[PDB]
Amino acid sequence: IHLENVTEEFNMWKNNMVEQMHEDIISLWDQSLKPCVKLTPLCVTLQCTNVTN
Amino acid sequence: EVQLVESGGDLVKPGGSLRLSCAASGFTFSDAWMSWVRQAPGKGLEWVGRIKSNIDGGTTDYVAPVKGRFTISRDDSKNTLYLQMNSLKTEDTAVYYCTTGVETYDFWSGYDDHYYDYYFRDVWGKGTTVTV
Numbered sequence: 001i002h003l004e005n006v007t008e009e010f011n012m013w014k015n016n017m018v019e020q021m022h023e024d025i026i027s028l029w030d031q032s033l034k035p036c037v038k039l040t041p042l043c044v045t046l047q048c049t050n051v052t053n
Numbered sequence: 054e055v056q057l058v059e060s061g062g063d064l065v066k067p068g069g070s071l072r073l074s075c076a077a078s079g080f081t082f083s084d085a086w087m088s089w090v091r092q093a094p095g096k097g098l099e100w101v102g103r104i105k106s107n108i109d110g111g112t113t114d115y116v117a118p119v120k121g122r123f124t125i126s127r128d129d130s131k132n133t134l135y136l137q138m139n140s141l142k143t144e145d146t147a148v149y150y151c152t153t154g155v156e157t158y159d160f161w162s163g164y165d166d167h168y169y170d171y172y173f174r175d176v177w178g179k180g181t182t183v184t185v
């Protein structure tokens with residue numbers, strides 16, 4: 001709804017929307033890992049050599 | 054692979070001193086108990102002494118006939134074991150060896166110490182001498 005004859009003091013580098021999105025995304029990302037397998041049984045000594053290719 | 058890298062052998066007389074030593078490779082000495090044994094030519098194996106790890110006190114045990122003149126110490130930086138000998142007898146001619154017991158317990162789980170792979174390695178140095 002174009003406001004016509006309005007002039008507003010915009011500012012990024014203060015906009016709190018940036019912070020909300022940051023929290024949201026980090027949170028959504030962490031929630032997606034809640035039901036997934038923890039690879040802790042695998043923290044063992046791995047003997048390693050070079051690839052035969 | 055575990056090795057005791059032995060050195061310090063030399064040509065000495067009873068009227069002198071000699072320090073023999075072993076540097077570990079693969080194996081470290083922070084938990085290593087270590088012991089010297091000697092074998093004079095034509096003889097069997099005679100224990101000289103033992104040093105416990107410094108984490109367990111650093112206590113030593115010496116065999117009476119070699120006590121005092123043969124002592125044992127540990128470096129704790131470069132994994133070196135030392136046998137410091139002073140004011141020796143004509144009876145001390147022998148091949149000296151450093152020895153240790155390597156205990157490895159590889160557990161199948163971090164939740165129970167019931168199922169595991171136990172490996173025991175007896176590691177010896179090459180043998181160095183005290184001469185007369």
Ligand SMILES: *[C@@H]1O[C@H](CO)[C@@H](O[C@@H]2O[C@H](CO)[C@@H](O)[C@H](O)[C@H]2NC(C)=O)[C@H](O)[C@H]1NC(C)=O
Pocket residue numbers: 050051052053
């Ligand atoms: C990684 O190492 C394994 C062995 O630990 C290689 O697998 C063997 O390959 C030979 C040759 O084809 C077969 O005869 C054996 O039966 C294979 N063993 C097993 C357990 O599969 C494997 O090829 C190596 N992979 C790479 C990329 O180097």
